Amino acid sequence: LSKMSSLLERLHAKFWSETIKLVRQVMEKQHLVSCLETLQKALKVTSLPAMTDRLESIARQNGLGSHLSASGTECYITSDMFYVEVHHGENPVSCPELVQQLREKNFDEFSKHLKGLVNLYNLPGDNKLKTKMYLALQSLEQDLSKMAIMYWKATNAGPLDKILHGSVGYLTPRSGGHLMNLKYYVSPSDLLDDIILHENNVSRSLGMNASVTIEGTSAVYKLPIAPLIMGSHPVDNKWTPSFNSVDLPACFFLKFPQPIPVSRAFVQKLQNCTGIPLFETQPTYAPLYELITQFELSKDPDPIPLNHNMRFYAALPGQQHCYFLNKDAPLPDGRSLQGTLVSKITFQHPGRVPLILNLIRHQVAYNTLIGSCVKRTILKEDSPGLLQFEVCPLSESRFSVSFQHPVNDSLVCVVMDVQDSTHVSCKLYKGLSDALICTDDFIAKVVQRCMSIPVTMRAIRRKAETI
């Protein structure tokens, strides 16, 4: 709260023109003591020799065997991260995958990918798994690219029904400035270019995408050490039979960002494809929708308190509205909704997993899209509208929406089950004496394609209402 240590007392407590004899008479003698040399990025711009010197300093401090002829160029001591832009395993690679993103002045993919792969490819193995198994898993991670190309060739209609939704196939190359990924999110009703307008496949970098990783500690499962199955399969794809197979100390542990709530049936079905289930811990069987809505809307949420308390009031096409969530409500099913509040994504070798992941992905996507209507709208005591509805998840992926239909003097529910991955069932149940306020399969498929609770509410209030 003062500035008396800059020019008033700084130069007076430094213990001129002829008092610079401190280079040879008083010289008889980078983390938290010497910040001058550590702040090379602030004194000078990020250049070739500056980064090469910083890398060498970090290697000498933390401990990493690496050197060169002189200062001005430095490689990366790893399995295959050795690449000099502009031999103990693989040869010197100069592919564009690690030259495009870091061409001229990039400074992001220089201390995260390297450190990431170093932390991942680190274990108690001494020259037996730190390098051998790492290279084996890196080489084995190439059949998916051939499988991706085969899926792209087979699905020559559009990259919307096979790449993102339905099944896997929206993959990209995992090298340098881009790691392995997949189409986890499948939000089709986002802000599009007004089925994205692209020349070729997306590298899962333009916008938002998940992050798939390959690491493990005790999941030493039998897997190949080289790509064998590479021929074009009959219709969609073919498996790769291994076992030339050793106990490779690695796995396919991805990075699940949010604890998406799933069903017990999906986890039980997936618990028979890759050994054990997708999580080994105490299952947090708490209200699934309650925590899932907060986890999903937590991105946009600001530091201001919300305090919804199971209130799902939201807006409308031209007014305000309201809704519920039926959270923490034990249905006739008996036990409450199973919760999967965990971040363990420790998978196993790519065995019979052609649909072991896509089903749970579609389930989680439908669950998210259900609570999509409540993201940041906070408006209570709305006398007008207030199309309150309670999604009753009695069965797995089975929702219901109640609306004050003018047909009868009561609410109007409709069974909303996710039959397909994007074509959900939107049937409805009317009354013995009720007007035809129930739309046809046209509006049902429209709402299915929309997959938004607020969209359905607006449709009921505008199209189905007709009043």
């Binding site: 529910c413 149940y429 009354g431 013995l432």
Partner: protein
């Protein structure tokens, strides 16, 4: 006619579910004609509901069968034509509440109301 806006107001909000008795007594003449009570509300709500358990209403049903017109409840859960639909989810709760209803005993009606309730059961 007041029953329509009454049940609309009831379902429209998640009240304390016990203040419902007070709200009904206030909004209703408290003894005009109890033949337009919750007795038919359950069925007229579950009709449009169909494959839905309609929660938050069974509590009202219980707070009614505590001390209300047991005869009307009996005849209306009897004439309920749910066997054709056979939801096996709502009729389950119906038989559950009917079990505890018929377990202990019926009540006095000072008339052939008992015989009517017997025909109903």
């Amino acid at each position: 006619v007041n029953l329509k806006q009454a049940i609309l107001q009831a379902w429209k909000e998640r009240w304390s579910d016990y203040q419902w008795a007070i709200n009904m007594k206030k909004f209703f003449p408290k003894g005009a004609t109890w033949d337009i009570l919750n007795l038919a509300d359950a069925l007229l709500e579950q009709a449009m509901i169909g494959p839905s358990p309609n929660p938050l209403i069974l509590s009202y049903l219980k707070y009614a069968i505590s001390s209300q017109m047991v005869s009307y409840s009996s005849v209306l859960t009897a004439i309920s034509k749910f066997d054709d639909f056979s939801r096996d989810l709502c009729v389950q709760a119906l038989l559950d509440i009917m079990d505890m209803f018929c377990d202990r005993l019926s009540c006095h009606g000072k008339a052939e109301e008992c015989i009517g309730l017997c025909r109903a059961l």
